[PDB]
Amino acid sequence: DGVGNASGDWHCDSTWSEGKVTTTSTRTWVLPTYNNHLYLRLGTTSSSNTYNGFSTPWGYFDFNRFHCHFSPRDWQRLINNNWGLRPKAMRVKIFNIQVKEVTTSNGETTVANNLTSTVQIFADSSYELPYVMDAGQEGSLPPFPNDVFMVPQYGYCGIVTGENQNQTDRNAFYCLEYFPSQMLRTGNNFEMAYNFEKVPFHSMYAHSQSLDRLMNPLLDQYLWHLQSTTSGETLNQGNAATTFGKIRSGDFAFYRKNWLPGPCVKQQRFSKTASQNYKIPASGGNALLKYDTHYTLNNRWSNIAPGPPMATAGPSDGDFSNAQLIFPGPSVTGNTTTSANNLLFTSEEEIAATNPRDTDMFGQIADNNQNATTAPITGNVTAMGVLPGMVWQNRDIYYQGPIWAKIPHADGHFHPSPLIGGFGLKHPPPQIFIKNTPVPANPATTFTAARVDSFITQYSTGQVAVQIEWEIEKERSKRWNPEVQFTSNYGNQSSMLWAPDTTGKYTEPRVIGSRYLTNHL
């Protein structure tokens, strides 16, 4: 519309309705020029870290974390009152564009606003580009609305053959300039809308019943079983008579059951006390990567991280495994720490009702057929696939964690739910790409056909607004006694938690999940 006319307004709120909540959040961004306006191929030959790909001049908006869209109070309203959550619609606006040219002269930089410069924006609706937005990486909106964030650079990997960097003829190059874009000056604004495909509600609740306890504790089964092959409490001694008996109440472990616990992939267990662990190197002949549970994909090890949902130790427990996500705590110097107390550990232990424990076996199975001569042998089940009549509970969604993921495009998928967390989507929210259009510097007066390298140094800033409509289930329980709630128990604090400190810094003190209200199997 105009230079001196604002192209949008600031909107950040949540509005709660009967069956739905609509959260809006606005942020301020700054977009640098990446790679001097030019694509660059990436790669390194590493034993398991081997990768190859392309970094692009473009940058993109990552909307996928829950604290982008929710405050800590709104997250409390949600999880305390509701059994389920799923996203419905999404809407995005990019407005109040400002492009700034900078001038380095006489050892000092001055910034002026270039009014005729443009910025390019397109959302990829057809999913034609590699989708990196679900990778669980950085570059999303800040949790706190006053923060200004930097738009992350876009890049993508490609199929790696073995442990060697080198590309083959299968590798694709995608040129972002080969899509149609929208070019925006300071008067122009961008907008798009999106609809989520129907997806099961995330279950925000814990079970108040175990699987193996689903029976009536008063009654007996009409089913019989073999109690023992001999008299006495000692093995391989007795009168050698087979005793059959009815299954009476009080001895549930022998009840015949309709269902089974969920699948397992065992994890290696580590103690938070440093002296209580076996000494393992970070890198070398024996890596910690070797001793963790990994999968070999094309001669490349990769952790199973978290892996299939499995019950975990409590957040405060003195042991952890890779089945637990780890977030930085309130006070961290960054990139390293020697103490687990600085870290904030996730725990799935609420799902211990239906699911086997990450660091413990699924069960034990007979390895032979006994006879009078041969004693029975059983053995541990470390990894178990799904079986008919098996039930399991998904991993929990967190306030700091990802909302969705893109289901890979493949001829088969089983229970498409993301192992980090959230909502598997075949057509997730489309990636929105933005770059500063190049402005050439002063050209030569004669003609040359070499591409022009010299460019005016610029960056742009602006405002971005996101609106997601969510759909929620109200808890409908006949439970008498009070349910657990998410409360602030933090007590007497010199400086308020979940608020800026004396220096203005805002951090998130705790990891908070969605499962509080109980329900029954």
Indicate the residue among 196 and 350 with the shorter CB distance to a copy of itself.
350
Distance CA 400, CA 204 (A): 16
Indicate the residue among 311 and 468 with the shorter CB distance to a copy of itself.
311
Distance CA 357, CA 352 (A): 7
Place of tokens 């869209």: 69
Least CB distance from residue 424 to a copy of itself, whole Å?
A: 8
- What lies within 8 Å, CB to CB, of 143 at 6+ separation is 65, 67, 68, 400, 506, 508
Distance CA 185, CA 96 (A): 9
Distance CA 472, CA 18 (A): 9
Least CB distance from residue 60 to a copy of itself, whole Å?
A: 9
Indicate the residue among 195 and 257 with the shorter CB distance to a copy of itself.
257
Place of tokens 């001999």: 230
Least CB distance from residue 92 to a copy of itself, whole Å?
A: 17
- DSSP state string for 350-375: GGGGTS-BTTS-SEEEE-S---SSSP
Distance CA 439, CA 310 (A): 54
Indicate the residue among 89 and 214 with the shorter CB distance to a copy of itself.
214
Least CB distance from residue 222 to a copy of itself, whole Å?
A: 5
Least CB distance from residue 32 to a copy of itself, whole Å?
A: 4
Residue 71 has φ and ψ, to the nearest 5°, of -95, 175
Least CB distance from residue 88 to a copy of itself, whole Å?
A: 19
Least CB distance from residue 466 to a copy of itself, whole Å?
A: 14
Least CB distance from residue 117 to a copy of itself, whole Å?
A: 8
Residue 439 CA from chain centroid, whole number? 38
Q: How many CB atoms lie within 10 A of CB 394?
A: 20
Distances (CA, A) of 455 to 41, 306, 438: 21, 45, 7
Widest distance between CA atoms in the chain: 109
Least CB distance from residue 433 to a copy of itself, whole Å?
A: 11
Q: Which residues share a beta bridge with 29?
A: 149, 462
Indicate the residue among 209 and 331 with the shorter CB distance to a copy of itself.
209
Least CB distance from residue 193 to a copy of itself, whole Å?
A: 19
Distance CA 280, CA 269 (A): 13
Taking the CA atoms of 317, 322, 327 and 332 in sequence, report the sign of the dihedral they define: positive
Contact between 431 and 451 (Cβ < 8 Å) = no
Indicate the residue among 195 and 250 with the shorter CB distance to a copy of itself.
250
Query: Of 35, 34, 14, which is closest to residue 24 (Cα–Cα)?
Result: 14
Contact between 128 and 34 (Cβ < 8 Å) = no
Instruction: Give the CA-trace dihedral at 275, 279, 280, 284, to 10 degrees.
Output: 130
